[PDB]
Amino acid sequence: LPMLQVALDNQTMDSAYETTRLIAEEVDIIEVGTILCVGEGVRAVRDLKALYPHKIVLADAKIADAGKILSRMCFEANADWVTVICCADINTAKGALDVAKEFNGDVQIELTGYWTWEQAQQWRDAGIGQVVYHRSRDAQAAGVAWGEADITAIKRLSDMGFKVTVTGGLALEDLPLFKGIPIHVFIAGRSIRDAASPVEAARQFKRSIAELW
Amino acid sequence: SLPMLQVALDNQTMDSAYETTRLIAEEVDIIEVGTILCVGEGVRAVRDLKALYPHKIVLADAKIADAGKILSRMCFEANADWVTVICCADINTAKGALDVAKEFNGDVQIELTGYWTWEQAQQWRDAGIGQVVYHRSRDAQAAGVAWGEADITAIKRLSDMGFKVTVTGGLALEDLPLFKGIPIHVFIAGRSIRDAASPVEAARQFKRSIAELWG
Numbered sequence: 001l002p003m004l005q006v007a008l009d010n011q012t013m014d015s016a017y018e019t020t021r022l023i024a025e026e027v028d029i030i031e032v033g034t035i036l037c038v039g040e041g042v043r044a045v046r047d048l049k050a051l052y053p054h055k056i057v058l059a060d061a062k063i064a065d066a067g068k069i070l071s072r073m074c075f076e077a078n079a080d081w082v083t084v085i086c087c088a089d090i091n092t093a094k095g096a097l098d099v100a101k102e103f104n105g106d107v108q109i110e111l112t113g114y115w116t117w118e119q120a121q122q123w124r125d126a127g128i129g130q131v132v133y134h135r136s137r138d139a140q141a142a143g144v145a146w147g148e149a150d151i152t153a154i155k156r157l158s159d160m161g162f163k164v165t166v167t168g169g170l171a172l173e174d175l176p177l178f179k180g181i182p183i184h185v186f187i188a189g190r191s192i193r194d195a196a197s198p199v200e201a202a203r204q205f206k207r208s209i210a211e212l213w
Numbered sequence: 214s215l216p217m218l219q220v221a222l223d224n225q226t227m228d229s230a231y232e233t234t235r236l237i238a239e240e241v242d243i244i245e246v247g248t249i250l251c252v253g254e255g256v257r258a259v260r261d262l263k264a265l266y267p268h269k270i271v272l273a274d275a276k277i278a279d280a281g282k283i284l285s286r287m288c289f290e291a292n293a294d295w296v297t298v299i300c301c302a303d304i305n306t307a308k309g310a311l312d313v314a315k316e317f318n319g320d321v322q323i324e325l326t327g328y329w330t331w332e333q334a335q336q337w338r339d340a341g342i343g344q345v346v347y348h349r350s351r352d353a354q355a356a357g358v359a360w361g362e363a364d365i366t367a368i369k370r371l372s373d374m375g376f377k378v379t380v381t382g383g384l385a386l387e388d389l390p391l392f393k394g395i396p397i398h399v400f401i402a403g404r405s406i407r408d409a410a411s412p413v414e415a416a417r418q419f420k421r422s423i424a425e426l427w428g
């Protein structure tokens with residue numbers, strides 16, 4: 001089944017803990033959001049992995065250059081997975097992946113904003129096995145909906161051999177759009193953290209995934 | 214005008230950054246909180262460095278990719294003067310960051326990398342972005358990529374479009390003459406200053422060379 005990831009896009013650790021104390025056991029992956037990496041730094045990764053060592057911890061660092069250096073910082077803080085932004089030089093992705101392998105971790109390419117199909121082939125050739133198909137929050141706020149072009153791109157990525165994560169303002173009602181595609185992970189940030197009942201929100205995502213897959 | 218000099222604090226902790234700033238804060242124009250310091254310490258790095266050096270321009274090299282208003286507000290509330298937005302970001306991310314920047318009398322720069330296009334560059338101008346950072350990736354440099362002709366052409370074209378262009382990416386002193394005759398806004402040095410036997414003398418050599426080349 002597709003896994004469920006919660007995004008902790010919080011500015012401070014104590015704010016993040018308001019969510020994790022409710023739903024850490026209701027999800028498969030705990031993400032240190034980019035917002036939390038910028039708010040608190042990499043201690044957020046170390047602290048969350050110490051609290052939840054049985055969960056996959058994703059550092060959404062969106063590494064853009066100095067791949068081996070930033071990745072080592074994240075993996076020394078006990079991250080399992082780290083993100084590399086799609087426009088990074090290929091050598092950045094390669095360097096981050098080399099370090100990830102030292103720590104028995106992994107790298108995901110974050111498809112946030114503009115990228116090309118040629119770049120996608122380069123990632124595959126480099127040994128990258130995960131991508132995050134992300135509808136930008138700012139694009140969403142400007143009225144951009146999930147649509148057919150996204151579904152065709154996701155399927156194309158999956159067919160290239162990537163394990164694809166889908167994310168970007170997902171609501172429970174969006175999940176059927178992706179039915180029949182072997183999605184690796186769905187991420188929910190706002191729709192879990194900001195729900196009247198975060199526990200019910202997480203359980204509803206899991207129930208719907210179980211029904212659809 | 215002479216190109217200004219920016220020091221990049223690509224350090225993992227504040228104390229490591231301070232080993233540099235205590236030597237060269239008054240030897241450079243702009244103090245950059247490097248991306249790895251932003252990720253290493255978080256936005257306290259911006260707050261602390263601006264409190265130490267309130268008369269200097271402080272740049273947060275956050276390379277914002279999405280959530281432009283949220284991340285830019287975090288940096289500007291920490292008293293940044295300038296923030297970076299990565300070139301692949303949705304145009305609404307750049308616009309959101311810029312709108313916040315204006316509230317704080319700050320500014321945004323687009324960090325150039327990847328396969329950005331000239332049409333995107335026009336989008337940034339149309340959105341009111343006035344600064345770009347022409348950056349040779351550190352990882353590309355390590356893979357043998359040199360500064361060269363296509364870079365000069367692109368830098369000149371960005372300048373002609375109306376951007377103030379910053380040049381950066383493993384610059385050494387000997388690289389500066391490559392850019393002579395172009396109205397470069399800022400040169401950034403990270404490693405060439407921080408890792409010098411004498412960071413003060415390295416900064417001063419950059420300044421002397423700039424003064425000759427653009428004098």
Ligand SMILES: O=C(O)[C@@H](O)[C@@H](O)[C@H](O)[C@@H](O)COP(=O)(O)O
Binds near residue numbers: 008167170279
């Ligand atoms: O770009 C960012 O850093 C976040 O907007 C993004 O990574 C976020 O973590 C999403 O992937 C999930 O959060 P939402 O479900 O609230 O969009």
Ligand SMILES: O=C(O)[C@@H](O)[C@@H](O)[C@H](O)[C@@H](O)COP(=O)(O)O
Binds near residue numbers: 247382404405
């Ligand atoms: O991508 C990064 O975060 C840095 O590699 C980059 O921004 C760096 O700060 C350079 O602009 C200046 O540092 P060097 O002179 O050491 O390349």
Ligand SMILES: [Mg+2]
Binds near residue numbers: 032033
């Ligand atoms: Mg995220």
Ligand SMILES: [Mg+2]
Binds near residue numbers: 248
């Ligand atoms: Mg930098």
